[PDB]
Amino acid sequence: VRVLATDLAFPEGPVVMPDGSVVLVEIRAQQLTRVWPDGRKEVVAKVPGGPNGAALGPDGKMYICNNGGFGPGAPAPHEYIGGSIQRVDLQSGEVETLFDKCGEHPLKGPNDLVFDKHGGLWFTDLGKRRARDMDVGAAYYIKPGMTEITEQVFGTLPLNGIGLSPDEATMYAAETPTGRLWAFDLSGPGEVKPRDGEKGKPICGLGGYQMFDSLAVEASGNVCVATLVSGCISVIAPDGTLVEQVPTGDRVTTNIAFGGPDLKTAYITLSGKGELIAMDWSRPGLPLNFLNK
Ligand SMILES: [Ca+2]
Ligand code: NA
Numbered sequence: 005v006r007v008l009a010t011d012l013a014f015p016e017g018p019v020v021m022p023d024g025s026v027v028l029v030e031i032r033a034q035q036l037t038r039v040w041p042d043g044r045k046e047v048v049a050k051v052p053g054g055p056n057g058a059a060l061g062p063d064g065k066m067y068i069c070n071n072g073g074f075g076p077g078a079p080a081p082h083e084y085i086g087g088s089i090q091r092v093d094l095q096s097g098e099v100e101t102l103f104d105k106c107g108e109h110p111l112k113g114p115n116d117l118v119f120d121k122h123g124g125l126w127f128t129d130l131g132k133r134r135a136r137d138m139d140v141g142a143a144y145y146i147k148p149g150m151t152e153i154t155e156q157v158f159g160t161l162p163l164n165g166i167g168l169s170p171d172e173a174t175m176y177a178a179e180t181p182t183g184r185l186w187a188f189d190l191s192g193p194g195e196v197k198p199r200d201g202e203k204g205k206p207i208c209g210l211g212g213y214q215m216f217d218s219l220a221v222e223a224s225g226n227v228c229v230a231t232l233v234s235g236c237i238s239v240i241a242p243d244g245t246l247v248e249q250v251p252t253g254d255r256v257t258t259n260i261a262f263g264g265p266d267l268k269t270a271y272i273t274l275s276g277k278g279e280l281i282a283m284d285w286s287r288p289g290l291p292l293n294f295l296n297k
Contacts, residue, residue, distance in 0.1 A: 006282040008271070009039045014076065015273040015280050016218070017058035017116065019066065019295065020263025026271055026280060027066060027094070029055035031074060036066065036092050039280055049097040053085045056130075057116035057218065057259075060295040061150075062123050066092045069114035069127050078133035087111035089127065089146065089153075103146070106153040112139045116166050116218045116259070119293045123148040124194045126156075128163040128177055138162075143177050145194040156196050157188065157203050165219030165229055165259075169242065170290050176227050178219055183210035185219075185229055185240050207244030214238075218259035221290040223267070230257045230272070237272070252281070262289020267296065 013033030024041040054071035117127035125146040131139025141163035165178035189197040217230040237250040256276030267289040291297040
C-alpha cells in the first residue's frame with residue numbers, strides 16, 4: 005500500500021487518468037483536485053457545494069455529481085445549495101452546471117456516476133438529511149448526448165456507489181445504510197428491464213453493522229464496494245457471493261478506482277484519514293468508457 009496524498013478534505017470520486025495522475029474531489033474543500041504521480045496537489049477548479057463523485061466523459065471533460073453540500077453530516081439550510089450534475093474542463097478549469105433538476109424535481113444529493121458505451125450517464129442520488137427527515141435514494145440516467153435525465157430507480161434508501169457489469173447489461177447500485185448491493189437488469193442502455201415494491205434484486209446484504217459507499221467493477225464482473233464502519237473493500241460476485249473483504253484501515257473508506265499497469269492497482273479514498281492510497285489488486289479492473297476504452 006502506497007500513500008499518494010494526505011491532508012485531503014474528505015477525498016472522493018477518484019478518476020485514475022492514463023498519465024498516472026488521479027483527479028478526485030474533496031467534498032469538504034469543495035474542489036476538484038489533481039494528484040500528480042510525484043504527489044504534488046493541484047487544484048483543477050473550485051466546485052462550490054459538495055463535489056461528491058467524478059467520471060471522465062466523451063469530451064475529455066470531468067463530469068461531477070454535486071451533492072449541494074455537507075455539514076460529514078446533515079447540512080444546515082444555508083450551506084446546502086442544491087444538487088446538480090456539473091462538468092469541469094481540465095484545461096481551462098471552467099465549471100458548467102448541466103442539470104439542477106430531474107423534470108421538475110430539484111436534484112438532492114447526487115453522489116456517484118458511470119458512463120455507458122453510448123455516452124449515457126448513470127448517477128445515484130443519496131438524498132439530503134435534514135433535522136427530522138431525509139430524502140429517499142434514487143438512480144437516474146442522462147440519455148446519450150447529455151440531453152435529458154430519466155428517473156430509473158426511486159424510493160429506496162440512499163443510493164451511493166453505481167456501476168455497470170462488463171457487458172453493461174446490469175447496473176449496480178449500493179444502498180448505504182443497509183449495506184446492500186442492488187443489481188438491476190437492463191433491457192437496453194439506460195432502461196431498467198421490465199419486471200423485477202422493489203425495482204431490483206438485493207444480491208448481497210452484509211451482516212452486522214456495515215454500510216456501503218462507492219464502488220468499482222472488475223473485468224471479472226466482481227463488484228468492489230467501499231464498506232463503511234468495517235473499513236474495507238467488499239468484493240461481491242455477480243451472483244451476490246461475498247468473495248472477500250480487503251481491509252483498508254479507515255472506518256470511512258468511500259471509493260475505489262482501478263488504474264496503473266493492467267488496471268491491477270486499486271486507488272482508494274480513505275476519507276476519515278484524508279488520504280488517497282494505492283493498493284495492488286489481485287485481479288484487473290473493468291475499463292471505464294472514455295477513460296480506459
Ligand atoms: Ca460515494
Ligand atoms: Na469508483
